[PDB]
Amino acid sequence: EAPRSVDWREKGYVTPVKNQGQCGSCWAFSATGALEGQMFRKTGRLISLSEQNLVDCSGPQGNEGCNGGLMDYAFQYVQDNGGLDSEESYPYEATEESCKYNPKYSVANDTGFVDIPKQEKALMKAVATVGPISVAIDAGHESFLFYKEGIYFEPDCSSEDMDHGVLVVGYGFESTESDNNKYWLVKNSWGEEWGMGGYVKMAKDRRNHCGIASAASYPTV
Numbered sequence: 326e327a328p329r330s331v332d333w334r335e336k337g338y339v340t341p342v343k344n345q346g347q348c349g350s351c352w353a354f355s356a357t358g359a360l361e362g363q364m365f366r367k368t369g370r371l372i373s374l375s376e377q378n379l380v381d382c383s384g385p386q387g388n389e390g391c392n393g394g395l396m397d398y399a400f401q402y403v404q405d406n407g408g409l410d411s412e413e414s415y416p417y418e419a420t421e422e423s424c425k426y427n428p429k430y431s432v433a434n435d436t437g438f439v440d441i442p443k444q445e446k447a448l449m450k451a452v453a454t455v456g457p458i459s460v461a462i463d464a465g466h467e468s469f470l471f472y473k474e475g476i477y478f479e480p481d482c483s484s485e486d487m488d489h490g491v492l493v494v495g496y497g498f499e500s501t502e503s504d505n506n507k508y509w510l511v512k513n514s515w516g517e518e519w520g521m522g523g524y525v526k527m528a529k530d531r532r533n534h535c536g537i538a539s540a541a542s543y544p545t546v
């Protein structure tokens with residue numbers, strides 16, 4: 326099943342890499358990334374969404390602002406809230422502020438989310454059919470912090486204890502690397518100076534490396 330390569334950037338699903346700065350807001354960037362993709366699918370307009378709106382306002386859903394949160398809680402907030410503001414109307418400050426949500430500037434919405442079954446084959450299918458997917462990974466490693474090029478593979482990685490929300494925008498394979506040659510194409514939120522222009526190729530089909538298939542979901546819009 327599924328194409329041998331997918332890349333939602335080339336279809337215009339994906340906003341430029343952003344930078345969460347010194348705020349534990351990775352979950353919000355992964356969520357706005359998944360939502361940006363699904364709104365684009367619906368409407369043909371690609372609009373950067375407000376991570377700050379999610380940071381300040383999705384407390385009721387269970388999120389903890391700059392201290393952490395889950396993508397599904399963010400999707401739940403957008404639903405509960407009846408909308409989400411744009412990045413330009415509600416810009417990123419990288420700290421906890423009073424919730425400033427103004428429905429007058431809502432440019433997005435959803436009707437819940439879908440959690441993907443915990444298998445890479447299932448992630449493959451969802452990426453191929455739906456668009457960018459929110460995923461969490463065990464990013465807690467020097468080798469990840471200082472990642473720059475190639476297919477990321479970390480022997481001590483965990484498939485069960487993930488700590489970092491990112492966005493899978495596709496998958497592929499190295500004509501270079503073809504032995505364990507496949508990778509997920511992953512949009513991170515640490516600015517463009519990290520990894521490959523802010524992106525990382527995570528090892529694909531290596532028995533759920535770093536837990537990339539263990540917490541995948543997307544908003545239904």
Ligand SMILES: *[C@H](O)C(=O)[C@H](Cc1ccc(OC(C)(C)C)cc1)NC(=O)[C@H](Cc1ccccc1)NC(=O)OCc1ccccc1
Binds near residue numbers: 349350387388462
């Ligand atoms: C976000 O950037 C995260 O990475 C954060 C933990 C963390 C690790 C390392 C850093 O340092 C920098 C890289 C420099 C920023 C910062 C923060 N992770 C979360 O927010 C997690 C990850 C996750 C896992 C699975 C699904 C979604 C997201 N969410 C979280 O920590 O969950 C705990 C929780 C919070 C609130 C309520 C209930 C549970």
